[PDB]
Amino acid sequence: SPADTNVVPAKDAPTTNSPPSTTSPNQAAADANQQQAGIVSSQSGPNAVGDSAPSSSVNNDGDIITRPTSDSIAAVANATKPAA
């Protein structure tokens, strides 16, 4: 029974479920993933307490991004263009 014999991490899996948050990026994501898996809260006790998941917002550096790393470089760049 194929399409089962071979299952690999989905496209961009690290941070798929990760919800667009500005409060606790990781916690918020370690939860979308939590409910996502279907694992009820009351079921996993101590575990689902202090935990993080890669977040779709957190970006590669600590900083809690609010838009693509690229469109952010684009902001700084644009805001600096003396009249040719």
CSV table of C-alpha atoms in Angstrom, one decimal:
chain,number,residue,atom,x,y,z
A,1,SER,CA,0.0,0.0,0.0
A,2,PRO,CA,2.1,3.0,-1.4
A,3,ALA,CA,1.8,6.7,-0.5
A,4,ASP,CA,2.4,5.2,2.9
A,5,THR,CA,5.4,2.9,2.1
A,6,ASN,CA,7.2,6.2,1.5
A,7,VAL,CA,6.4,9.3,3.6
A,8,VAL,CA,8.9,12.1,4.0
A,9,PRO,CA,8.8,15.4,5.9
A,10,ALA,CA,6.5,17.7,4.0
A,11,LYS,CA,7.6,20.8,2.0
A,12,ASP,CA,9.1,23.4,4.5
A,13,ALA,CA,8.0,21.1,7.4
A,14,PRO,CA,10.2,22.8,10.1
A,15,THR,CA,7.7,25.7,10.1
A,16,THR,CA,4.5,24.9,8.3
A,17,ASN,CA,1.9,24.9,11.1
A,18,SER,CA,3.7,27.8,12.8
A,19,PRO,CA,1.0,30.6,13.2
A,20,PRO,CA,1.8,34.3,12.5
A,21,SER,CA,2.5,35.5,16.0
A,22,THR,CA,4.4,38.4,17.6
A,23,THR,CA,4.0,37.3,21.3
A,24,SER,CA,5.9,34.1,21.8
A,25,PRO,CA,6.8,32.9,18.2
A,26,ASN,CA,8.1,29.5,19.3
A,27,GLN,CA,5.6,28.7,22.1
A,28,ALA,CA,2.8,29.7,19.8
A,29,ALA,CA,4.3,27.4,17.1
A,30,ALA,CA,5.0,24.5,19.5
A,31,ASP,CA,1.3,24.6,20.0
A,32,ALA,CA,-0.2,24.9,16.5
A,33,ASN,CA,2.0,21.8,16.0
A,34,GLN,CA,0.8,20.4,19.3
A,35,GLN,CA,-2.9,20.5,18.4
A,36,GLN,CA,-1.9,19.8,14.8
A,37,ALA,CA,-0.6,16.4,15.7
A,38,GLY,CA,-3.9,15.9,17.4
A,39,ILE,CA,-2.2,15.4,20.8
A,40,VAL,CA,-4.7,16.7,23.3
A,41,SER,CA,-3.4,19.2,25.9
A,42,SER,CA,-4.5,17.4,29.0
A,43,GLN,CA,-2.9,14.3,27.5
A,44,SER,CA,0.7,15.5,27.4
A,45,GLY,CA,1.3,17.1,30.7
A,46,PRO,CA,4.7,18.5,31.7
A,47,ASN,CA,5.8,17.9,28.1
A,48,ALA,CA,3.6,20.4,26.2
A,49,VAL,CA,4.5,23.0,28.8
A,50,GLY,CA,7.8,24.7,28.1
A,51,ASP,CA,8.6,23.9,24.4
A,52,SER,CA,9.4,25.5,21.1
A,53,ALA,CA,9.2,24.7,17.4
A,54,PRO,CA,10.9,26.5,14.6
A,55,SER,CA,8.6,29.4,13.9
A,56,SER,CA,7.6,30.9,10.6
A,57,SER,CA,8.3,34.3,12.1
A,58,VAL,CA,11.4,33.9,14.3
A,59,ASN,CA,13.8,34.1,11.3
A,60,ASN,CA,17.3,32.8,11.3
A,61,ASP,CA,18.5,35.2,14.0
A,62,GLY,CA,16.9,35.6,17.3
A,63,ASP,CA,14.9,38.7,16.1
A,64,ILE,CA,11.1,38.2,15.7
A,65,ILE,CA,10.7,39.1,12.0
A,66,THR,CA,7.4,40.5,10.7
A,67,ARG,CA,8.0,39.8,7.0
A,68,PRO,CA,10.5,37.9,4.7
A,69,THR,CA,14.2,38.4,5.5
A,70,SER,CA,14.4,39.6,1.9
A,71,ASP,CA,11.6,42.2,2.0
A,72,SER,CA,13.2,43.4,5.3
A,73,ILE,CA,16.6,44.0,3.6
A,74,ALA,CA,14.5,45.7,0.9
A,75,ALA,CA,13.1,48.1,3.5
A,76,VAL,CA,16.5,49.3,4.8
A,77,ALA,CA,17.8,49.5,1.3
A,78,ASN,CA,14.9,51.5,-0.1
A,79,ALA,CA,14.9,54.0,2.8
A,80,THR,CA,18.4,55.0,1.6
A,81,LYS,CA,18.6,56.3,-1.9
A,82,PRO,CA,19.8,59.9,-2.5
A,83,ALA,CA,18.3,61.4,-5.6
A,84,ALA,CA,20.4,60.1,-8.5
